[PDB]
Amino acid sequence: LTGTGVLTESNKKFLPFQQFGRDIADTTDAVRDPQTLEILDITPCSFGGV
């Protein structure tokens, strides 16, 4: 799973087989690190009109 974002360590309890989580519609909102099994909330990298 790939993208660009701001990673924050996060309080969400994924189940022992869940690798990922998703928002209201498809967006991969969080992930488990496949080294130390903590959960990281993936915030979008900031963007906006100049």
Partner 1 sequence: DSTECSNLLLQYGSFCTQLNRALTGIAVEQDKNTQEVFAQVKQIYKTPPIKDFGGFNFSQILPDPSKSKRSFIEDLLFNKVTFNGLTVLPPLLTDEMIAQYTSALLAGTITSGWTFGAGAALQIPFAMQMAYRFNGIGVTQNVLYENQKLIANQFNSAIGKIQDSLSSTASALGKLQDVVNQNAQALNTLVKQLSSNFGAISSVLNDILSRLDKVEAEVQIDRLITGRLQSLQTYVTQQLIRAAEIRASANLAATKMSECVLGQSKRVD
Ligand X SMILES: *[C@@H]1O[C@H](CO)[C@@H](O)[C@H](O)[C@H]1NC(C)=O
Q: Which of 9, 11, 25, 37 binds partner 1 (CB under 8 A)?
A: 25
| Chosen residue from 6, 20, 33, 38 binding a copy of itself by CB under 8 A | 20
Sign of CA dihedral 2, 42, 4, 7: negative
Closest among 34, 35, 2, 42 to 18, alpha carbons compared: 34
CB of 6 to a copy of itself, least distance (A): 14
Residue 49 sits in the site that holds partner 1 (CB under 8 A) = yes
Half-sphere exposure of 20 (CA within 13 A, CB side): 8
User: Does residue number 9 form part of the binding site for a copy of itself (CB under 8 A)?
Assistant: no
